[PDB]
From a paper:
Ferritin is the main iron storage protein in most living organisms, playing a key role in iron homeostasis and detoxification. Ferritin has prominent octahedral 4-3-2 symmetry, and each ferritin molecule contains 24 C3–C4 interfaces, 12 C2 interfaces, 8 C3 interfaces, and 6 C4 interfaces, which provide several potential pathways for metal ions and small organic molecules to diffuse into its inner cavity. Thereafter, we introduced a self-assembling strategy by designing π–π stacking interactions at the shared protein interfaces involved in two different kinds of 3D protein nanocage superlattices, which is referred to as key protein interface redesign (KPIR).
Subsequently, Pro156 was replaced with His, termed P156HAfFer. To elucidate the detailed structure of the 3D protein arrays, the high-quality cubic crystals of P156HAfFer were obtained, and subsequently, its crystal structure was solved at a resolution of 2.50 Å. The space group is I23, with unit-cell parameters of a = b = c = 229.16 Å and α = β = γ, indicating that the SC lattice was yielded by P156HAfFer. As expected, the introduced histidine residues formed two pairs of π–π interactions between two neighboring P156HAfFer molecules. Additionally, two pairs of electrostatic attractions were formed by Lys93 and Asp94’ between adjacent ferritin molecules. Although such electrostatic attraction is also involved in the formation of the SC superlattices, the designed His-involved π–π interactions play a dominant role because wild-type AfFer cannot assemble into such SC superlattices. Although the adjacent P156HAfFer cages are not aligned along the C4 rotation axes perfectly, the dislocation angles and distances are almost negligible relative to the entire cage-like structure of ferritin, and thus, they do not affect the overall SC structure.
Residue numbers in the entry:
A (entry chain H), B (entry chain E), C (entry chain F), D (entry chain D), E (entry chain A), F (entry chain C), ...: 3 to 169
The structure:
Amino acid sequence: TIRQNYNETSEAGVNKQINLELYASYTYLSMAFYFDNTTVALPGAHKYFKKASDEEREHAMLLMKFQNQRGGTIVLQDIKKPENDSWGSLKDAVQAALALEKHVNQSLLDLHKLADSKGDAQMCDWIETHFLTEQVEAIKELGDHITQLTRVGHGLGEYTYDKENLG
Amino acid sequence: TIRQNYNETSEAGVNKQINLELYASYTYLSMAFYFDNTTVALPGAHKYFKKASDEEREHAMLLMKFQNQRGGTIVLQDIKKPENDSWGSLKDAVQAALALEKHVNQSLLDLHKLADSKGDAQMCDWIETHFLTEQVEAIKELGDHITQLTRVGHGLGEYTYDKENLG
Amino acid sequence: TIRQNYNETSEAGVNKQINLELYASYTYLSMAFYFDNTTVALPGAHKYFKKASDEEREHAMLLMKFQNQRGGTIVLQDIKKPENDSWGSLKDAVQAALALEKHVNQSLLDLHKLADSKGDAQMCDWIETHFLTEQVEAIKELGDHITQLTRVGHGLGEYTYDKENLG
Amino acid sequence: TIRQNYNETSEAGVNKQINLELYASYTYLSMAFYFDNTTVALPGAHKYFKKASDEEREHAMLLMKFQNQRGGTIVLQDIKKPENDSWGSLKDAVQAALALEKHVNQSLLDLHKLADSKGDAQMCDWIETHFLTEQVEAIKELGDHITQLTRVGHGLGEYTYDKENLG
Amino acid sequence: TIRQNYNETSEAGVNKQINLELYASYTYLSMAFYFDNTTVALPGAHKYFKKASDEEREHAMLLMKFQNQRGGTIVLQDIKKPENDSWGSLKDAVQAALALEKHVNQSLLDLHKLADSKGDAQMCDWIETHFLTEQVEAIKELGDHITQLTRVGHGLGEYTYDKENLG
Amino acid sequence: TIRQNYNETSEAGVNKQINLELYASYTYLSMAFYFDNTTVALPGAHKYFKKASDEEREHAMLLMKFQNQRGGTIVLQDIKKPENDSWGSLKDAVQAALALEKHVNQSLLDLHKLADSKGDAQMCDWIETHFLTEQVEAIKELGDHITQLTRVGHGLGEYTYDKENLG
Amino acid sequence: TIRQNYNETSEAGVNKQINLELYASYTYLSMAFYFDNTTVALPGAHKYFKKASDEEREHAMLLMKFQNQRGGTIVLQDIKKPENDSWGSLKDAVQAALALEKHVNQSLLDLHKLADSKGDAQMCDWIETHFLTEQVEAIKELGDHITQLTRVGHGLGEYTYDKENLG
């Protein structure tokens, strides 16, 4: 009875993005503690990625809160385990994160393009306010990270950028 | 000479939104002082609804300011007296407020699709920023109030929800 | 059961002073946003008349609270739109205001004359305490405002009084 | 040689009201301690009525002070013991106080109407300033209380209103 | 243009009350500096009566401010010289001020009766608010002083009551 | 490798908008120091336009930061010198600025239209969030200034508005 | 009638320098945002050159202020777009700024030598006070930077100097 201008296809897209943000959260947590293994031992990457895990779990909860505000119903799925068990050099993990965030961006845009076709002006603006520029700034951050990490090279530079920059 | 991309039909629609926001305001004032009558005596509801009345008046001034900013012209109408002189129990009045808020939301969504068809980016963003999400938030709040007022039940519970939740 | 020494003619009297007060709130809010128009651009009168709109809206609620205190029943009517869509010069606006407040004042005294003619000591003293002198002091204020606005003249003077004295 | 415009009849009516304000005081102190009885044990009503009894003693001292200000002589009578020795439910006692304060308001308006017929402008205003509006608000407060006492009902609702609202 | 419900006779009354208030002021100033004289030399009464002069001139200015407010025209007259050049003992001086406030009080009550007959309810409340109760309190204070000046008697007692009570 | 859903015409439009806010920033610099001339010497207009010149500079910079954030390339052109070398009366300059801002507002709305047509949801919300409402507020502000500057006229009115309002 | 000892030729040379200080400003702002590009991502150089560009804009405003102080008229020219659209390595951009500031120092000494030949003692001193020593220190700072950029080398040394020393 609060539901208004809230399409069922939009409702299911919210449900798939919820799962999607949880999966991003689970993947970053895996990166965080891959950097906590003694054989890797990059503490700033671990701090940085652990908070990336917290933020994406906050994205999933925004989507959940929004599903309820609009009169939708929350339907949770399995959160697939991450696609790798270890994540390589630092630059490899950051490159993995960029690819993850671009796929997350693309789904948000698909979700956006979808509420638009259902005439859902509020849902469109809600997604712009909370996700579309944040995703854009997140992807620029990572692009910068990858360029700098190429600059300072393997070895002493990877340590330096992990300490003086990530966290 | 300050008018720029402001359609004659968009302006007329702001003028009717001004009236509707003033109608909401006057209805909530009726609700506020109904709950201050000795045969009802619910000080939470009165506080709560007096605030609501104040806010619907602020929305009406926003729109007037918005008309003036975009080069339009405020044209005022009578403010129709509210559909009821008394509003029953606490839950009933809450339900009337949900009914009115959904009606105000549909007028806003209509006004949004209108400016969109005249291709008025600034106006659609304006409605989104100041209104469309506040309507969703308020419609969710009213939904929760009707649900809890059902859980608390008549008698002691109506008083408790009124005292400890509303104002 | 709380009603005592409260004639049904007076209960009707308060109800219609309520409407009259709300009408003045709306007249003034029209004035305040007429002065917000680019073609007019008098920020001081905008502030001043906006304030005056809230103060008569508070007047209306005193009466509503009173009606309730004595054991009456509020019955709201429509709030008729203002006499005028636009308000001329600043002096023109202030002079219509003085007219409004003398009409209002007159009906307060016709409402007083009749709580008196029914032996309602407390109504008369409540009207005196909250209304008769506040009206007097306002009408004097507005008369001073008309005399000064004549004094400083159109154009630069109108500006200066608006800026330096109204808000 | 301080007496001026002070009717002999107004003076005796002040003396009877003095007795009536004390009568109220003693009735309230019998309520306040009935609710301190273990068979009743409502500490919130006890607090509440004890205060009321101080209030009504204070009123009595206002009238005595006034009789001295206007050149009259205070003549004291027995303070009749209250009408009951126990006062039933909390709602029973509140309705009973509404009746007392109803009688007192009638006695005060009749006093007002007496001094008005004797041309005593200062007396009329004094009664208006110290008593008549605060009797109206007292009757408003007690009516409201009764309505909320009927709403919360007997048992858990009586306890709650005792503890939360009275005292 | 501001004048409303303000009779020509009352306006003449406000003018005579103004002259009386100024006359009052000028008699207390005389008393004040009579006590400043070496042959009298009562400094507490000099302080006291000087404040009574300052306060009676404030009364004169309120009435003028009331005249301007109601749309009257202030018409001023000679301020007659007080009735005595010297005022005997401290008790005599108070007895003359008791005589003087009672004349003022009678004139204030004549003034009330007379706006009342013209149905000027604001003017009746105004005289009640600012003057009527104040006259009563001052006559009681003056009578109180007079009884005490009898009790302390002549000599050392007049000295003591001047220093320790007046100022 | 960060570029995503960013069209290549949009990227061109961001560069020409960059050139357009620098052209404005430079026009406002010209105006600011024209009023600093002894033959003109309006210090308030100096401050005011100097600050507008900084704000349009920052507009240019936000647009370059967005080009970078979105994965495009900044290409700059000559900053065309302002269209006049002197700016007439104060009211003339504020008219030139309204023209200038309405032209900016047109290209921003052409850039919004244009990204919309490519489906660039984030760019649209970016222009609404930083530019479209800011434009509308500046235009209203400017039109009010012209209306007031008209009212106060030339001579003392121009000096006064310069000093008390602009800067 | 303020102009004194101010040669026509000195005046035009001030105007050309104004253009040259702005030219520097726009060249630096193109550096500052090239280093904000993801392919470069040197936030320390971005901070650094953005500041330099504000500095050089400020210089421009000094010259405009001076041309007004000495009775001349400011004549604005196009601001030519910088020489490159991207600026290579961090050391490449610093050497390039050293060359710019070298040209500017030459243009400023030639301006100095011009006013000296025209007997303009105040102008010579002004250029000495606001520009010539702070060009020398600017050339000193940039030389030092280049030497430390050649010392830390490309890769890890570039990152470090960016982060630690510039910004």
